[PDB]
Design an enzyme around this catalytic site. Structure first.
Site, mmCIF file in Angstrom:
data_model
loop_
_atom_site.group_PDB
_atom_site.id
_atom_site.type_symbol
_atom_site.label_atom_id
_atom_site.label_comp_id
_atom_site.label_asym_id
_atom_site.label_seq_id
_atom_site.Cartn_x
_atom_site.Cartn_y
_atom_site.Cartn_z
ATOM 1 N N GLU A 1 -43.229 7.245 -25.459
ATOM 2 C CA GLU A 1 -42.334 7.946 -24.462
ATOM 3 C C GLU A 1 -41.766 7.365 -23.491
ATOM 4 O O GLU A 1 -40.078 7.964 -23.427
ATOM 5 C CB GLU A 1 -42.800 9.491 -23.544
ATOM 6 C CG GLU A 1 -44.045 8.765 -22.364
ATOM 7 C CD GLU A 1 -45.126 8.669 -23.308
ATOM 8 O OE1 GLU A 1 -45.794 7.091 -23.920
ATOM 9 O OE2 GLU A 1 -46.374 9.410 -22.534
ATOM 10 N N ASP B 1 -49.236 9.068 -23.862
ATOM 11 C CA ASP B 1 -50.439 9.142 -22.264
ATOM 12 C C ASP B 1 -51.171 9.691 -22.430
ATOM 13 O O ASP B 1 -50.968 10.017 -24.211
ATOM 14 C CB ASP B 1 -49.280 9.495 -20.781
ATOM 15 C CG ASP B 1 -48.313 8.491 -20.451
ATOM 16 O OD1 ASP B 1 -48.405 6.585 -21.039
ATOM 17 O OD2 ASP B 1 -47.876 8.324 -20.407
ATOM 18 N N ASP C 1 -52.980 11.602 -21.152
ATOM 19 C CA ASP C 1 -53.129 13.580 -20.957
ATOM 20 C C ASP C 1 -52.053 14.528 -21.795
ATOM 21 O O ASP C 1 -51.517 14.519 -22.453
ATOM 22 C CB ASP C 1 -52.779 13.163 -19.526
ATOM 23 C CG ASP C 1 -50.972 13.141 -19.329
ATOM 24 O OD1 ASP C 1 -50.715 12.271 -19.285
ATOM 25 O OD2 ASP C 1 -51.097 14.730 -18.702
ATOM 26 N N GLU D 1 -49.572 16.492 -20.880
ATOM 27 C CA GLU D 1 -48.699 16.149 -21.323
ATOM 28 C C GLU D 1 -48.729 15.835 -22.955
ATOM 29 O O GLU D 1 -47.475 15.653 -23.751
ATOM 30 C CB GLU D 1 -48.057 16.115 -20.037
ATOM 31 C CG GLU D 1 -46.312 16.112 -20.142
ATOM 32 C CD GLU D 1 -45.638 16.332 -18.825
ATOM 33 O OE1 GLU D 1 -46.029 15.918 -17.545
ATOM 34 O OE2 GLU D 1 -44.736 17.299 -18.539
ATOM 35 N N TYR E 1 -53.169 3.474 -16.122
ATOM 36 C CA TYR E 1 -52.041 4.917 -16.013
ATOM 37 C C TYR E 1 -52.504 5.133 -14.730
ATOM 38 O O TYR E 1 -53.615 5.018 -14.360
ATOM 39 C CB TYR E 1 -53.265 5.363 -17.430
ATOM 40 C CG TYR E 1 -51.794 6.397 -17.269
ATOM 41 C CD1 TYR E 1 -50.621 6.336 -17.412
ATOM 42 C CD2 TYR E 1 -52.450 7.437 -17.440
ATOM 43 C CE1 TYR E 1 -49.375 7.230 -17.021
ATOM 44 C CE2 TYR E 1 -51.470 9.072 -17.772
ATOM 45 C CZ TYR E 1 -50.237 8.909 -17.901
ATOM 46 O OH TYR E 1 -48.741 9.491 -17.911
ATOM 47 N N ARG F 1 -52.271 8.475 -13.362
ATOM 48 C CA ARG F 1 -52.636 10.139 -12.964
ATOM 49 C C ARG F 1 -53.720 9.653 -13.773
ATOM 50 O O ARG F 1 -54.148 9.954 -14.941
ATOM 51 C CB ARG F 1 -51.652 10.632 -14.530
ATOM 52 C CG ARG F 1 -50.561 10.373 -13.747
ATOM 53 C CD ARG F 1 -49.742 11.754 -14.696
ATOM 54 N NE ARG F 1 -47.654 12.038 -14.280
ATOM 55 C CZ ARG F 1 -46.707 12.493 -15.437
ATOM 56 N NH1 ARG F 1 -47.233 13.289 -15.879
ATOM 57 N NH2 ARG F 1 -45.305 11.914 -14.237
ATOM 58 N N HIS G 1 -61.257 8.994 -18.674
ATOM 59 C CA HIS G 1 -60.045 7.915 -18.234
ATOM 60 C C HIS G 1 -60.922 6.641 -17.218
ATOM 61 O O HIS G 1 -61.797 6.982 -16.809
ATOM 62 C CB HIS G 1 -59.148 8.622 -16.988
ATOM 63 C CG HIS G 1 -58.642 10.109 -17.622
ATOM 64 N ND1 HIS G 1 -57.750 10.373 -17.759
ATOM 65 C CD2 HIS G 1 -59.020 10.583 -19.449
ATOM 66 C CE1 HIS G 1 -57.093 11.234 -18.518
ATOM 67 N NE2 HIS G 1 -57.368 11.009 -19.317
#
Ligand code: ZN
Ligand code: ZN
Ligand code: ZN
Lengths: 49, 50, 50, 846
Positions: free
Chosen positions: D8, D92, D94, D96, D300, D302, D346
């Site tokens: 992304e 990533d 997650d 999304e 990361y 988030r 995570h």
DNA sequence: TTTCATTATCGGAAGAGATTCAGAG
RNA sequence: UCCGCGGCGCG
DNA sequence: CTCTGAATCTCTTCCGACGCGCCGCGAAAA
């Protein structure tokens, strides 16, 4: 050229070729030394070597 | 006994140790340590047993 | 002759000849003072209540 | 042969390429390439499901679309995927990232063999090599959960917003979690305005030891009861009695104390820390964290998992052992437990390489270096030996009174060494070594006066903490909630503190009354938990979407009805005694998206008897004194008048330089109003601040027949700018020039030519509705050169076509703040540019 | 007349200093 | 020309 | 279970005849 010249002129293992008599010629060309780079120095060579 | 005495516990810690040993006065770092180790021992760039 | 230095500069002998005379003059270890003198850390003169 | 890796971020692309090498090609797919429709490019329900794309009645059929400017990137991705042999989806960790990976797989096609889902927690050689040794399949369940969330939010926004336009005001918006956050802020505002700061006094005592040391204490009991005088006279009497009495140290207490570091940060903790220590809010914190991650220095950003890898733990333990040494190790790792529902797969937010000091971050801006320093310090601190304090408590008695001191002294510092406190606390002092049953000699004593603290206002980080406590939203959402509550005009943030607009109160009350199930914190939490169940694959997305939609539609169809039927109550007017400057009539108090304002009832009368006169309610912006500390909010509450009809506080507005207006907090539910006279420095119109480019004076925001414009206070200058759809204010108003001869292409509009800091650009005459903009071509300008203002003429002189005969467009070089002309082929730049240099146009390869 | 997120743009000896094990509290 | 460094031998 | 002192380990420094003789050769400074 600089590296070659420095090795052949100034290196410790490129000493003057002595020319007293032919026996000197032969014995100098056939001499085998342990000094010089990567070898050992005079002041530390023990009796074992 | 050697395994009882070595402070290290993984590949990273040993690499950090060897970096700290061969070059005092500079910070350790993952990539740089890995690079100098590999080029010092296991590469023809700096090492060659004729 | 003589030369004046833009910055006051210490002597090598008293700095490094073991035992470090300046070091014994103070209570500082020799290592932190030498790394100070090459400008990698400050030294503090107290005033007030920190 | 040649594998393709899709990511992304372009900076993620460059960083992962450092480790992948020549066997792989990496391509950046910037943002969501595919999405639900956004622009206009039982028939009312037909138009609603077309505008939504989603059809809830026809089983969630979605009608996805590719957005403007994505088509070029999609074509490049497709060309590279045709060239490549195997495709690696490296988004990533997650949902999304899964939804992006799904959209990529679906657009490029050939699903069953040509895709691998790569998953890594850090962008490093070992982590990347392990991820490419064992990639997964695409987690479709997490994609479905993300789609469910998106569908819910679009359903609520598009179905509710016309209702709010009809009943309350056009230009409102709504959102599921957004409305619940606004409800939280409004509830705290109501608690604050409906609070009374009481008055309590305290006494402080000064003492010297027989050994000449000095001690200061605070006085807390009278007659064996709590000491809490209510008034000044009482306090003075107490001080007298104290001075007369004789003091002795009847109590001597001592005890060791141990203090420990915090956990390594989760995203909410990182935002709270960055706000408290560095002052960064949410947007700056997450932007800098994203930069630090993309550069590769931190994991990361988030996450809600406090877990750490064994690699991380071993690295940091090594660092502590080498630098600090054994006393600060300690014997075994400091474990920290995250929530049972957390993404325990995570990691926490930690450095990728502990030895990289913040100063070394050559390519990071100073604020990002500070944020990295905070992350590093926390990560190092979490694993070290706890600190050690020894504590002393003293109590001293005189007459009817007892008085106390508490002090701590610090003797091992290990975690505090790396992570010091911001300031010394009240207990961070040295009490002298008085004996048990010691004696004391006395020095003069000081009273202090204090007021009851109201239920104090939330900041961005404390609102994020409240949301995290309730379970509304998730780590990825929080920044979007905090942004959108501001952008949508229901809440404003000032003094780093949250304040609730009157319109936010109106909308909150209406939504609570009509949509009680949607606005209830428990149902919001249960919905979030059900989305988490979907991502687990414990639940079926479409199912829960249907259940939500059935309930929502029931509540909507109830709410649509008339107010006598019980349907959503319309807007309302609260009348007061004031003379309209245009007609003299009584005047009423009104709320619009712009703010809170004074209106004349003739607005509701047909044209014949219509009155459009309006007055601004210039408010008394609360100016909290930072030097008052905790007092600053309490005194603000003290400053307010109180309503006659009720205990609720009152909020204050300026109507004339001679007159000022007070309005009750529960307006319009409460109808109390007050009017006051005095010499007032009234602003005419209050709100935002802007600096007039033509004279440097302050410029201010004003409302009229064309909505909202922006106008400059200097009476000698009438320079006015204007509001636009998605920015604070438009650029310098100078020569907006219309063209009828250039038609729009997505809309029926016609194109107009405009200047600003951005550059010189073509924009469509119905701008808030059309929102269609493109750069001009040179040939276009040449066609309409007579119209161009005197300066712009030079651009028409510019060379119209490049040496290849491609066609040329007019661009702003932000780095050098000048116009230039450039040519494009297949929509890519040709690499040719011409600039203006001393009256001439000079051209060459870019 | 519109509302939705979320992007990412040499060998040996001596001296001084530092970290290590053992005894006392 | 007088300076410095390295190598080689003699006793 | 922790703290201090004592002792060892690790690093750094110093220094190994002397007298010649012979040979050669300096520079990114001018
Ligand atoms: Zn009127
Ligand atoms: Zn009231
Ligand atoms: Zn102006």
């Amino acid at each position: 050229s600089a590296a070659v010249k420095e090795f052949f002129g100034s290196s410790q293992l490129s000493q003057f070729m002595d020319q007293n008599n032919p026996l000197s010629e032969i014995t100098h060309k056939r001499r085998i030394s342990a000094l010089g780079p990567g070898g050992l120095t005079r002041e530390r060579a023990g009796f074992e070597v | 006994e050697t395994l009882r005495v070595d402070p290290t516990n993984d590949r990273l810690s040993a690499l950090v140790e060897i970096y700290r040993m061969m070059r005092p006065g500079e910070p350790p770092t993952r990539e740089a340590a890995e690079s100098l180790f590999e080029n010092l021992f296991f590469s023809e760039d700096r090492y060659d047993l004729s | 002759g003589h030369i004046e230095l833009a910055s006051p500069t210490a002597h090598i002998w008293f700095l490094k000849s073991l035992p470090s005379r300046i070091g014994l003059l103070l209570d500082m270890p020799l290592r932190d003072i030498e790394r100070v003198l090459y400008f990698e850390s400050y030294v503090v003169i107290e005033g007030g209540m920190t | 042969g040649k594998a393709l890796v899709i990511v992304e971020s372009p900076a993620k692309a460059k960083t992962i390429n450092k480790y992948l090498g020549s066997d792989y090609v990496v391509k950046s797919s910037v943002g969501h390439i595919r999405d639900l429709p956004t622009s206009g490019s039982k028939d009312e329900r037909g138009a609603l499901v077309n505008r939504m794309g989603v059809d809830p009645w026809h089983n969630w059929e979605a009608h996805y679309e590719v957005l403007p400017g994505k088509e070029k990137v999609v074509s490049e991705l497709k060309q590279l995927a045709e060239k490549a042999d195997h495709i690696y989806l490296a988004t990533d960790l997650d949902r999304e990232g899964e939804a992006i990976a799904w959209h990529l797989r679906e657009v490029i096609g050939g699903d069953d063999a040509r895709y691998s889902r790569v998953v890594f927690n850090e962008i490093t050689k070992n982590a990347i090599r392990q991820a490419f040794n064992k990639p997964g399949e695409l987690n479709i369940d997490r994609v479905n959960a993300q789609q469910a969330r998106r569908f819910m939010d679009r359903v609520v926004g598009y179905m509710v917003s016309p209702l709010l336009w009809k009943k309350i005001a056009r230009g409102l918006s709504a959102g599921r979690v957004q409305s619940v956050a606004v409800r939280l802020v409004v509830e705290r505002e109501r608690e604050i305005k409906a609070f009374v700061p009481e008055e309590f006094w305290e006494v402080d005592a000064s003492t010297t030891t027989p050994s000449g040391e000095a001690l200061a204490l605070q006085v807390t009991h009278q007659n064996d009861k709590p000491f809490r005088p209510v008034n000044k006279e009482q306090t003075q009497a107490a001080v007298s009695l104290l001075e007369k009495a004789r003091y002795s140290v009847l109590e001597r207490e001592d005890k060791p104390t141990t203090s420990k570091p915090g956990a390594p940060f989760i995203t909410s903790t990182l935002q709270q820390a960055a706000s408290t220590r560095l002052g960064f809010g949410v947007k700056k914190t997450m932007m800098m964290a994203q930069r630090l991650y993309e550069a590769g220095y931190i994991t990361y950003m988030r996450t809600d998992s406090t877990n750490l890898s064994q690699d991380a733990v071993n690295m940091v333990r090594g660092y502590i052992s080498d630098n600090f040494g054994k006393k600060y190790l300690p014997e075994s790792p400091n474990q920290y437990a995250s929530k049972e529902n957390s993404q325990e797969a995570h990691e926490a937010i930690r450095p990728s390489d502990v030895n990289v000091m913040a100063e070394s971050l050559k390519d990071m801006e100073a604020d990002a270096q500070k944020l990295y320093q905070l992350i590093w310090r926390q990560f190092v601190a979490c694993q070290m030996t706890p600190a050690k304090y020894d504590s002393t408590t003293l109590t001293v008695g005189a007459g009817d009174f007892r008085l106390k001191a508490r002090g701590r002294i610090l003797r091992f510092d290990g975690w505090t060494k790396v992570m010091p406190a911001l300031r010394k606390g009240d207990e961070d002092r040295i009490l002298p070594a008085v004996n048990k049953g010691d004696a004391l000699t006395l020095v003069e004593l000081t009273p202090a006066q204090h007021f009851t603290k109201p239920p104090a206002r939330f900041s961005e980080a404390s609102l994020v903490k409240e949301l995290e406590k309730r379970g509304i939203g998730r780590p990825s959402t929080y920044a979007s909630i905090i942004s959108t509550i501001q952008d949508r005009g229901y809440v404003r943030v000032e003094n780093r503190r949250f304040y609730a607009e009157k319109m936010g109160e109106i909308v909150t009350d209406r939504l609570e009354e009509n949509f009680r199930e949607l606005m209830n914190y428990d149902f919001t939490a249960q919905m979030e938990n059900s989305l988490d169940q979907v991502a687990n694959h414990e639940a079926e997305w479409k199912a829960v979407l249907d259940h939500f939609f059935s309930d929502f539609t029931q509540q909507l169809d109830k709410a649509e009805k008339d107010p006598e039927e019980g349907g959503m109550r319309p807007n309302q007017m609260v009348l007061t005694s004031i003379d309209c400057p245009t007609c003299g009539r009584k005047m009423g108090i009104r709320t619009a998206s712009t703010g809170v304002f004074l209106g004349c009832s003739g607005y509701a009368l047909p044209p014949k008897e219509r009155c459009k006169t309006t007055i601004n309610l210039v408010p008394e912006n609360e100016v909290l004194n930072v030097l008052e500390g905790e007092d600053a909010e309490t005194n603000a509450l003290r400053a307010k008048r109180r309503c006659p009809k009720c205990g609720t506080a009152m909020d204050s507005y300026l109507i004339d330089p001679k007159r000022k207006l007070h309005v009750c907090g529960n307006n319009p539910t409460c109808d109390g109003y007050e009017i006051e006279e005095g010499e007032f420095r009234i602003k005419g119109y209050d709100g935002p601040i802007v600096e007039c480019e033509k004279c440097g004076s302050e410029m201010h925001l004003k409302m009229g027949r064309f909505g909202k414009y922006m106008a400059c206070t200097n009476e000698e200058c009438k320079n006015t700018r204007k509001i636009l759809r998605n920015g604070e204010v438009a650029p310098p108003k100078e020569d907006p020039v219309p063209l009828p001869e250039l038609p729009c292409e997505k809309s029926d509009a016609y194109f107009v030519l405009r200047d600003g800091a951005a550059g010189v650009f073509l924009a469509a005459n119905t701008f808030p509705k059309s929102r269609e903009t493109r750069a001009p071509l040179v040939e276009e300008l040449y066609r309409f050169r007579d119209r161009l203002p005197e300066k712009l003429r030079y651009l028409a002189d510019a060379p119209q076509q490049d040496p290849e005969g491609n066609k040329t467009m007019v661009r702003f070089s932000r780095k050098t703040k000048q116009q230039y002309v450039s040519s494009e082929k297949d929509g890519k730049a040709t690499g040719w540019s011409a600039f203006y240099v001393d009256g001439k146009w000079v051209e060459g390869k870019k």
